[PDB]
Amino acid sequence: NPVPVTYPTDAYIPTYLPDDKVSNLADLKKLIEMDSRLDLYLTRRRLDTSINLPTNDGGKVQYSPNLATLIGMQTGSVNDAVYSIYKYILINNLFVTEVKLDSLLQKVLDTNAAHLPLMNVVQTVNKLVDAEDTAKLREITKLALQLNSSAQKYQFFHELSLHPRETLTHYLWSSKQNELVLQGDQYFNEDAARTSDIYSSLMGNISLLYSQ
Amino acid sequence: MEKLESKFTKLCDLETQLEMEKLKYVKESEKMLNDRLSLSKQILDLNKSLEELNVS
Amino acid sequence: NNVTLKNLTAFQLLSQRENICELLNLVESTERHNSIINPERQRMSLEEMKKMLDALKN
Amino acid sequence: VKESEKMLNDRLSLSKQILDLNKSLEE
C-alpha cells in the first residue's frame, strides 16, 4: 500500500487554454510522456532477473557425506544445496500427481516413512547444513499548480468576456451566499457566550432540547 | 528538461551495468563447457581403466 | 492540510474578489507579476536553452 | 541456461551411477 503524504504529488496540467495563442504546450505534453516512458524502463530493470549461481566466512558450507550423493559436490552455498535437492526431487518424477520418497532419500533424510511433504524435506535440508528527486518532484508540482492557477484566472476572465451578464449575477449571488456562511460562527466565542447578551434561535432550541 | 537529464544519466549507467552482466555470461558458460569436455575425456579414460580390471 | 468549511468558503470569496476587484482596475498586482515574467527567469532560462541546445548537437 | 540445465542433470545423474558402481565391490 502506498503511503499518504501531506503535499500534492502531481497536477493535471490543464488543457483549456487556446492552443493557437499559447505555444509549446504540446511540447510540454511530449516531454512529460517521454519522461513517463524513460522511467518505465528503469523500474523494469530494477526488477531485473539474473541467473548467476545454478551450481557455480559463512557463505560456504561443508555438506555431509550423505547429502554429497544427491548433489555431486561436497561444498557450496546453501542456495546450491536447496536448488540441487529440488532438482533431484523433480528429475526422478517423485511428486504425487496421479513427495513420494526414493531409496537414497531414505538415508539422506534418516526416515523410513517413504512419503514426506516438501516442506519437511527442505527443513531437513537446513537441518543437515534518492533524496533530490523528492525536491525536484515538489518543485515541478509547485509550478504545475501555479500554471493551474493562472489558467483558472484566464478561464474566469474569458468566460466573463462571453456572457458577462451571466457571470456577474453569479458573482453577486456567490457573494450574497458566502458572506452569510462566514458570519454564522461569530456567536460562540467564550467572551460573548457568558455575558447574557445572546440569551435575551437560541430560545426555540431549548424547547426542542427539553422535549428531546 | 533538467529532470529528463537526471533520469537519462541513470540509463547511461544502466547500459554499462547491462553490458557488464552480459560479459559475465560468456566467461562463465564456456567454463562449464570446458569442464564438461574434461569430464567426458577423463570419464572415458576412467571407464576404460575400469573395464581393463575384472570389475566393470 | 487541515482545511475546513470556513477555511474553504473564505478562500472562494478571496479568489472571486481578487478577480472582480481587478476587473474594476482597483487592484494593483505588480509585485506578483514581478515574480514570473519580469524577473531574469524569462531571460536567464533562455540563456540556458541557448547553451543546452548547442550541447545537444554533439 | 540451456547449458547449465544439461550440466546439472548430467551431474546429478552421474552420482546415482557412481553410488551403485561402488556398490559393486565384491569383484
Swiss-Prot record, chain A:
Q: List the disulfide bonds.
A: none
Location in the cell reads: Nucleus
Q: What is known about what this protein does?
A: Component of the chromatin structure-remodeling complex (RSC), which is involved in transcription regulation and nucleosome positioning. RSC is responsible for the transfer of a histone octamer from a nucleosome core particle to naked DNA. The reaction requires ATP and involves an activated RSC-nucleosome intermediate. Remodeling reaction also involves DNA translocation, DNA twist and conformational change.
Any remaining note in the record? Present with 2470 molecules/cell in log phase SD medium.
Subunit structure of this entry? Interacts directly with RSC8. Component of the two forms of the RSC complex composed of at least either RSC1 or RSC2, and ARP7, ARP9, LDB7, NPL6, RSC3, RSC30, RSC4, RSC58, RSC6, RSC8, RSC9, SFH1, STH1, HTL1 and probably RTT102. The complexes interact with histone and histone variant components of centromeric chromatin.
User: Which family does the record assign?
Assistant: To yeast SNF12.
The name this protein goes by in its record? Chromatin structure-remodeling complex protein RSC6
**This protein's encoding gene:** RSC6
Swiss-Prot record, chain C:
Q: Which GO terms describe its biological process?
A: chromatin remodeling; G2/M transition of mitotic cell cycle; nucleosome disassembly; transcription elongation by RNA polymerase II
Its GO CC terms are: chromatin; nucleus; RSC-type complex
Keywords from UniProt, A to Z, are: Acetylation, Cell cycle, Nucleus, Transcription, Transcription regulation
Localization, per the record, is: Nucleus
Going by the entry's taxonomy, the superkingdom of the source organism is recorded as: Eukaryota
Subunit structure, interactors included: Interacts directly with RSC8. Component of the two forms of the RSC complex composed of at least either RSC1 or RSC2, and ARP7, ARP9, LDB7, NPL6, RSC3, RSC30, RSC4, RSC58, RSC6, RSC8, RSC9, SFH1, STH1, HTL1 and probably RTT102. The complexes interact with histone and histone variant components of centromeric chromatin. Component of a fungal-specific module (HTL1-LDB7-NPL6-RSC3-RSC30) within the RSC complex.
The extra comment attached to this record reads:
Present with 3550 molecules/cell in log phase SD medium.
Q: What does this protein do?
A: Required for cell cycle progression through G2/M transition at temperatures higher than 33 degrees Celsius. Component of the chromatin structure-remodeling complex (RSC), which is involved in transcription regulation and nucleosome positioning. RSC is responsible for the transfer of a histone octamer from a nucleosome core particle to naked DNA. The reaction requires ATP and involves an activated RSC-nucleosome intermediate. Remodeling reaction also involves DNA translocation, DNA twist and conformational change.
**UniProt-recorded name of the protein:** High temperature lethal protein 1
The gene behind this protein is HTL1
From Swiss-Prot, chain D:
Please list which residues make up the signal peptide. none
The PTM Phosphoserine maps to S24
Which positions are tagged coiled coil? 1-27
> Where does the UniProt annotation locate this protein?
Nucleus
Binding partners and assembly: Dimerizes via the C-terminal coiled coil. Interacts directly with HTL1, NPL6, RSC6 and the N-terminus of STH1. Component of the two forms of the RSC complex composed of at least either RSC1 or RSC2, and ARP7, ARP9, LDB7, NPL6, RSC3, RSC30, RSC4, RSC58, RSC6, RSC8, RSC9, SFH1, STH1, HTL1 and probably RTT102. The complexes interact with histone and histone variant components of centromeric chromatin.
Other facts? Present with 3380 molecules/cell in log phase SD medium.
Record's function text: Component of the chromatin structure-remodeling complex (RSC), which is involved in transcription regulation and nucleosome positioning. RSC is responsible for the transfer of a histone octamer from a nucleosome core particle to naked DNA. The reaction requires ATP and involves an activated RSC-nucleosome intermediate. Remodeling reaction also involves DNA translocation, DNA twist and conformational change.
The protein depicted here goes by the name Chromatin structure-remodeling complex protein RSC8
The gene that this protein is the product of is RSC8
What stretch of the complete protein does the chain hold?
462 to 488 of 557
